[PDB]
Amino acid sequence: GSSGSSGTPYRAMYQYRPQNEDELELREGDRVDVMQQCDDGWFVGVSRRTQKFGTFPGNYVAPVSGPSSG
């Protein structure tokens, strides 16, 4: 009995190597669930492999959703 988490679908263009639990690991061709967008550009969401939450370099992932309206 609680609200759910709504995020945007993404894809890890390349594999990432997080040197801290805080950072979320990524794999070339992996689905990512972005939640918030960092000013600099980074993204903060959850992975689809380890179901973990953290921060990763958006430069490695990309918006698979496609052409959306905002």
UniProtKB/Swiss-Prot annotation:
Coiled coil location: none
Effect annotated for changing Y60V: Loss of SOS-binding ability
Cysteine pairs bridged by disulfides in the record: none
Domain of life: Eukaryota
Tissue spec. comment: Both isoforms are expressed in different tissues like heart, placenta, brain, skeletal muscle and pancreas. Isoform beta is especially found in liver.
Chain residue ranges for the region called Binds to SOS: 8-64
Residue stretches making up the SH3 domain: 8-64
Quaternary structure, from the entry: Interacts with DLG5 through its third SH3 domain. Interacts with vinculin by the first two SH3 domains and the proline rich region of vinculin. Binds to SOS (guanine nucleotide exchange factor of RAS and RAC), through its third SH3 domain. The formation of this complex is down-regulated by phosphorylation of SOS. Interacts with INPPL1/SHIP2, SAFB2, SOCS7 and SRCIN1. Interacts with FASLG. Interacts with MAPK1/ERK2.
Functional summary from the UniProt entry: Vinexin alpha isoform promotes up-regulation of actin stress fiber formation. Vinexin beta isoform plays a role in cell spreading and enhances the activation of JNK/SAPK in response to EGF stimulation by using its third SH3 domain.
Protein name as it appears in the record: Vinexin
Naturally occurring in which organism (per UniProt): Homo sapiens
Section of the entire sequence shown: 615 to 671 of 671
